[PDB]
Amino acid sequence: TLQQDRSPDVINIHSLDEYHNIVSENILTVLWFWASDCGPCKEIEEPLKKMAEDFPNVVFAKVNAEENQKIVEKLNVKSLPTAIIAKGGKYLGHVVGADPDRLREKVQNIIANLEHH
Structure with missing residues (x-):
């Protein structure tokens, strides 16, 4: 695959500054x-x-909620x-609960909707 371009390591967000910067990128993001x-x-x-x-x-x-009360x-x-x-x-979406x-279904559906819009 070419999307293997990046590594599947999950980022940990440590500030509102970082959060805004990540959410601003033109790539689907799950937080x-x-x-x-x-x-x-x-x-x-x-x-x-x-995933x-x-x-x-x-x-x-x-985003650890104890660390990032402001977010x-x-x-x-x-x-x-x-x-x-x-x-x-x-x-574009949110899933509450475990x-x-x-x-997974929501991520797939959002990708499809975005690409075929």
Whole structure:
């Protein structure tokens, strides 16, 4: 594949500055809000890494909610885990709760919609 161009390592976001910079890029981005003391968050860690491998055209990033209260506030994230899907500064979806298959379906559907628009 050519999208293997990049490595499937998941980024960890440490500031609102970094968050805005990443969401601004013209590539589909999945931002995963989580916390260490969140049971359902643990269940999606490995599915998230596998998804990063399967979708090398998609940037996957994690936002720790305990570390980034300002981002949680600005986005009004109300429960964990929460996945936000964006591209080029635009918000395109979100999946609330620990459901890897829902998130995978949503990423695939958004890619298809964006490309065939």
